[PDB]
Design a protein around this nucleic acid. Sequence first.
RNA 1: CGCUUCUCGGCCUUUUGGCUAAGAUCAAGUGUAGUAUCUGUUCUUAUCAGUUUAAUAUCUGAUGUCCUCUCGAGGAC
Lengths: 105, 56, 118, 59, 43, 99
Amino acid sequence: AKHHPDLIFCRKQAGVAIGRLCEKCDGKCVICDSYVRPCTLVRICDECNYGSYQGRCVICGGPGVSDAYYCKECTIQEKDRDGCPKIVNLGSSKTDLFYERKKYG
Amino acid sequence: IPWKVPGLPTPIENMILRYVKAKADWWTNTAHYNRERIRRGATVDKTVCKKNLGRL
Amino acid sequence: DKLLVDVDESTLSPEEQKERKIMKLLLKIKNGTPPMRKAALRQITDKAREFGAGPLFNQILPLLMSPTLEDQERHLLVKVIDRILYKLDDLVRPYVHKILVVIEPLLIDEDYYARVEG
Amino acid sequence: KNLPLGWDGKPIPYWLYKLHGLNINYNCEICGNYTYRGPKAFQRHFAEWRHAHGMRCLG
Amino acid sequence: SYECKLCLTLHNNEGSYLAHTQGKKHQTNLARRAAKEAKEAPV
Amino acid sequence: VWRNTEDEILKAAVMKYGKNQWSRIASLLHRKSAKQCKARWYEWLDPSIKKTEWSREEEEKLLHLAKLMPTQWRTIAPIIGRTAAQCLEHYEFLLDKAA
RNA sequence: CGCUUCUCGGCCUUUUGGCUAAGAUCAAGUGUAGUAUCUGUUCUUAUCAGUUUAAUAUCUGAUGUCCUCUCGAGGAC
Ligand SMILES: [Zn+2]
Ligand SMILES: [Zn+2]
Ligand SMILES: [Zn+2]
């Protein structure tokens, strides 16, 4: 997302499987990282919906609870045409916070 | 803490020392007396206990 | 152990040995406050190519071989090895087999995040 | 000694002299082979009276 | 924010500004401003 | 440790407030305690701390004393007018250049 | 007219009600990423050649031929 530049997206061909977000992350656009005006639905790459990953939070990786949408901006500038936005790197943040957790308590 | 302000007309300083000596001696003697009360048990109080501790 | 004694930098005429000395900033990375960690990590990321692979790995890998590695220390060292890997691109070609000989265990271990990292 | 003056009234640090290119000399034939010190003085001189007068003498 | 008109430097805290006044930068600017001013006056 | 900014704020705060309310003062800077302010002021900051090198006579006195009254630095340091820290390290330094 | 003293007008200074146990008391979240500002510290070498740069810079390297004096010097070239 716009906030950790170390993150990556799948960027293969979109498909027909809709994308879902955890209850934790829910309520936002995936890219413009805002919280408003959902216009259109997300679609994800075939691999990025294969396997156990049926119904996972694109971002948080967790349980699918709702649908994932696109802000009015991103759909106006057509940033919504770059295929799977599935993030195929976990990122340092989750790792480090879990590690400090295991240390502390 | 030695209080020594130099420019004072010596007779004025003489007065002030007479008076502070009076007052401090009164302070002491009342401390002697309250502590004797408190050791004799005579009375209670939540102030004249903390006050006397401080003075003593 | 080197860090215990002291000697002047010029007298450390083996300027590669000077490099090694200042490289033992690794200890600051390993143990040290969050700010020590951040500053050290930037130091090493950007002086990476200046240091070069040989010294870096020859002084990193022994750590990772430590029996007394705890968790934090380990994930920290893998963080660095990653960042320097992103700077040194080819220079690792001589050092691959070493890198694997140490990373491999992360592939088979009960931690999840350790597997995904390695 | 070997460096120019400033509004402080004393010479400039030798690295400032090199950084501003004041160690580079540019000659202008139209100005009577006058030597300008550094790129800024040599860019300004095209609008200065000496160059304008040289151009006027050439018609 | 706090500005030194002699050095054209910005200072965030009042602590930063007082520490800037004791500097090779501030002091040398103060001393240069000093000597120049003195020389610069005139039946 | 202390940074020059905290140091300057200390100077000003003291000269304003007088030497007696360290609570207000330490309330001012973050990550500074009233005990520390008091200690630092009397140790280093206060103007009466004489900051020069040791005379030969001062070192004569120091050495002689630290031989007279072993390891009592807060007893000595008033007698030669420096802090316990100055007396201590400087006696260490004389002892090391001797040996 | 000179001296001196007093009266007043124009006015360029400081100016919280005290005692008590200095009345009593005396707060800081964490992490990940990046920038800015101060404090600090340092370049006079001459060419040439190279590297590199938009241009410097940087960085890299070396200090016409012969003799001799002590990088300098004299002469036959
Ligand atoms: Zn968006
Ligand atoms: Zn995908
Ligand atoms: Zn999520």
